[PDB]
Design a protein around this ligand. Structure first.
Ligand code: ZN
Lengths: 42, 783
RNA sequence: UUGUACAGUUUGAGGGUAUAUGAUACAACCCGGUACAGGAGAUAACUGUACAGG
């Protein structure tokens, strides 16, 4: 339904995912620094 | 460094930084070092002070309820602390509310005059019986800090020769005689003895006591503070009303006493940023220290100055002004002082770890006062040892008062205010504490653990059942009666022990005493002996140790055990020739004399022998006979049965002591011992004709009901009734000779309840007409 | 017995069901084409906790 809070994966859910933490981001942003609510394309 | 981020890849260590930031926002941090028990520990939580192994474990911990509620409490505390000082209108409203409360429930000058009139009337009534005594008002009556409902406490001082119990009993007698006081009663077993009365015209409960030290001085100190500083009294009355609404002033339910808050009401003034009430002890006087503060103590007050004395453990006496001699005393309104008081007690002071004292500015550490850090502690100025806030000993009650303080501070930090129980408690209900059992849940008045409350009528006694009771009593006497050969063996054992002891300490003489020579000798009972030295500052401990060492040499004696913690140190061992326990004491002449008295009491009639033997077997069956277990010794039970026999419609046995004085060890040992002509000097001899079984059933009935242990002492010395108060004692039994030794002093409450239950069960089994054996039914542990 | 609070198992009640057009004999979920986020599972008995007892 949604990407894991850690690793940004899709195989497991937020609670299901338990692997070590990974950089926060979304595949749409494509970069760690950029944030969805403020992107160049918008 | 438990772990280093250099290992992680750039994206990896960046994500690890984000994870650490998130954990930090939840009050979870890293570990500088790890314990040997948990080498895998890598995190910790400050709120719970809890170690954590890994990041997954940390994320698991936050999900729990512990951290959630801790963070909620932290948020509430932050909200409380963020509030700024109150605005002038709000503080004026609070002051008006305090004024209204004091006017409605506070004391007035008319009340003080009326109480003075009560005291004068009591003085006039008491002149004919206690002309030299002088009465004064203390506590709430004289302090003005209490409520009009609060009782009238009157202390009567007497010449040093007179004794407190005697003066108080005489006061009760005069109160009973007079008609101005109705409902005269005595509560002599409270914290301080009191006589409670209710004057007819006044209707105000008055408690009369005497010799109340540390109370008159304390109330006069509070009165001086109130007179000199008018701002104190409104705060004290408001705080007392708050305590009453929160239901913590009464110490019966485990709360703090009512007047304690007064000591606290001044305290926050003392510890405030500007001390309104100056301290009375400190480094001002020469040779002062915190360790010496205990010796330092307030002595008296007069002419607006407190005089205090210091005695080294040279004497230093000095007077200090009660109030600061400063013209710039701040004009803080009462409401501001009240709000600052609430803030001080909530989120600005350590109630748990600091002692509330008004003598020294620097907060005395609980360790210096050798007090626990679990709960509140209030220091009374005129009694250093006492911790006046000890009535609260249950953590739930502490949490309740803390919640009351928190809610009232939040409420107190067209504005209108009011003192209400619901607002302060916020729906929480108190937690009554049983002061009698030290437990929680049941009030003293109704509680499962009340032996006195422990009844149904007995069935009628048929002649056959009475005959059966007499037969079983005689059977017990015969079964437990030592034979002649047993007496000869005991004499030989005593002689052998004396001879063996003489080897190391020549001249030693041994005399048998106790069950062996007191007329009531139990089969297989302990052999009690007393050792003396011919022609002889002797240390009981060293002598007992030497005797035990000597006995250890003997092959026959094994498991030698010297005991010195007891009042009379003794050597207890096992003799193979007797095959029984043997106890040896040193210079226990008083024991021999009391045993001889009991022997005479047995010799007068055989009914006494039968009764004592049946009592001993009944006690042994219930597992209360042995003294080492903490229960009353068999001597206490034989004393009880003798006392019962003496005090009965037909007097079975007379008081030998009552019917020249010889002082050995410091007490009189006289008692009529010529039984042969006893009837001549005794006018009631032969009046008793009840059967042994009937007499024993009467004994059980008398002790189960028709007797009081709290208000009477089981003493065989006096035919007349004796009262516990006159002995200043608070089951209690007095020796026939020594009046300062109580056999029930070491008896715990639980064992007393069990003993009363055993007596009730014995009364139930006996006296009920109706087992494989007749004897067994009357003596059965299960029933 | 006493004041307290959570480690595995079950039922009853919860958050979720937004981002889809066709299917699937009683033998078969499918190409999600747009919802926005710094957010990570609550209640009762099943004998395992860490503080106070006296
Ligand atoms: Zn994932």
């Amino acid at each position: 339904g949604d990407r894991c809070y850690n690793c940004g994966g899709l195989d497991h859910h937020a609670k299901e995912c338990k692997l070590p933490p990974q950089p926060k981001k979304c595949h749409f942003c494509q970069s760690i620094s950029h944030m969805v609510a403020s992107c160049p394309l918008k | 460094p438990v772990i280093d981020e250099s290992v992680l890849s750039t994206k990896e260590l960046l994500g690890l930084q984000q994870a650490e930031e998130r954990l930090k926002r939840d009050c979870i941090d890293r570990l500088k070092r790890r314990p040997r028990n948990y080498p895998t520990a890598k995190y910790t939580c400050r709120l719970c002070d809890v170690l954590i192994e890994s990041i997954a474990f940390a994320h698991k911990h936050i999900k729990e309820k512990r951290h959630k509620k801790n963070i909620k409490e932290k948020q509430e505390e932050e909200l409380l602390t963020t509030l700024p000082p109150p605005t002038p209108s709000q503080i004026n409203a609070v002051g008006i509310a305090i004024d209204k409360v004091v006017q409605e429930f506070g004391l007035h000058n008319e009340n003080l005059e009326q109480r003075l009139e009560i005291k004068r009337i009591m003085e006039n009534v008491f002149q004919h019986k206690l002309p030299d005594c002088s009465l004064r008002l203390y506590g709430s009556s004289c302090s003005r800090l209490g409520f009009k409902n609060s009782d009238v406490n009157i202390d009567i001082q007497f010449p040093a020769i007179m004794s407190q119990p005697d003066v108080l009993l005489l006061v009760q007698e005069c109160l009973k005689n007079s008609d101005s006081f109705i409902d005269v009663d005595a509560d002599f077993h409270a914290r301080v003895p009191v006589v409670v009365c209710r004057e007819k015209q006044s209707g105000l409960l008055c408690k009369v006591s005497a010799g109340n030290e540390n109370a008159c001085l304390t109330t006069k100190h509070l009165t001086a503070l109130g007179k000199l500083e008018p701002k104190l009294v409104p705060l004290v009355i408001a705080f007392r009303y708050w305590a009453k609404l929160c239901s913590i002033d009464r110490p019966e339910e485990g709360g703090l006493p009512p007047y304690v808050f007064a000591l606290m009401a001044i305290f926050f003034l003392q510890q405030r940023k500007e001390p309104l009430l100056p301290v009375y002890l400190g480094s001002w006087i020469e040779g002062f220290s915190l360790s010496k503060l205990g010796n330092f103590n307030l002595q008296d007050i007069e002419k607006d100055v407190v005089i205090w004395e210091h005695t080294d453990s040279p004497i230093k006496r000095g007077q200090v002004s009660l109030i600061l001699d400063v013209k710039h005393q701040p004009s803080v309104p009462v409401g501001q002082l009240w709000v600052e008081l609430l803030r001080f007690y909530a989120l600005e002071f350590n109630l748990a770890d600091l002692v509330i004292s008004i003598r020294v500015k620097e907060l005395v550490s609980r360790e210096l006062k050798d007090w626990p850090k679990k709960r509140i502690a209030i220091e009374d100025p005129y009694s250093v040892k006492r911790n006046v806030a000890r009535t609260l000993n249950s953590q739930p009650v502490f949490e309740y008062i803390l919640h009351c303080l928190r809610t009232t501070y939040k409420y107190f930090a067209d504005f209108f205010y009011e003192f209400s129980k619901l607002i302060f408690t916020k729906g929480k209900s108190p937690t009554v504490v049983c002061s009698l059992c030290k437990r929680e849940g049941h009030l003293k008045k109704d509680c499962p653990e009340d032996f006195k409350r422990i009844l149904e009528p007995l069935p009628p006694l048929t002649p056959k059942f009475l005959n059966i009771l007499d037969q079983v009593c005689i059977q017990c006497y015969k079964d437990f009666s030592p034979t002649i050969i047993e007496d000869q063996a005991r004499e030989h054992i005593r002689q052998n022990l004396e001879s063996f002891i003489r080897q190391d300490f020549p001249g030693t003489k041994l005399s048998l005493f106790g069950s062996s020579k007191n007329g009531f000798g139990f089969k297989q009972s302990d052999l009690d002996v007393c050792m003396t030295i011919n022609g002889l500052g002797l240390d009981c401990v060293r002598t007992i140790e030497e005797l035990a060492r000597v006995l250890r040499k003997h092959s026959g004696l094994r498991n030698i055990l010297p005991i010195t913690t007891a009042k009379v140190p003794i050597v207890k061992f096992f003799h193979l020739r007797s095959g029984l326990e043997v106890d040896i004491s040193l210079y226990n002449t008083l024991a021999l004399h009391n045993t001889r008295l009991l022997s005479a009491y047995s010799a007068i009639d055989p009914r006494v022998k039968y009764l004592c033997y049946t009592m001993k077997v009944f006690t042994k069956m219930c597992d209360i006979g042995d003294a080492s277990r903490g229960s009353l010794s068999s001597y206490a039970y034989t004393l009880m049965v003798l006392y019962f026999l003496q005090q009965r419609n037909p007097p079975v046995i007379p008081v030998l002591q009552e019917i020249p004085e010889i002082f050995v060890d410091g007490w009189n040992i006289y008692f009529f011992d010529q039984i042969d002509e006893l009837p001549t000097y005794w006018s009631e001899c032969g009046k008793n004709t009840e059967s042994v079984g009937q007499l024993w059933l009467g004994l059980l009935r008398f002790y189960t009901e028709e007797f009081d242990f709290k208000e009477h002492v089981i003493s065989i010395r006096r035919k007349s009734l004796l009262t516990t108060f006159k002995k200043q004692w608070t089951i209690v039994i007095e020796d026939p000779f020594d009046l300062n030794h109580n056999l029930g002093a070491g008896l715990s409450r639980k064992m007393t309840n069990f003993i009363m239950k055993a007596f009730i069960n014995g009364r139930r089994v006996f006296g009920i007409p109706v087992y494989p054996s007749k004897m067994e039914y009357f003596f059965d542990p299960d029933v």
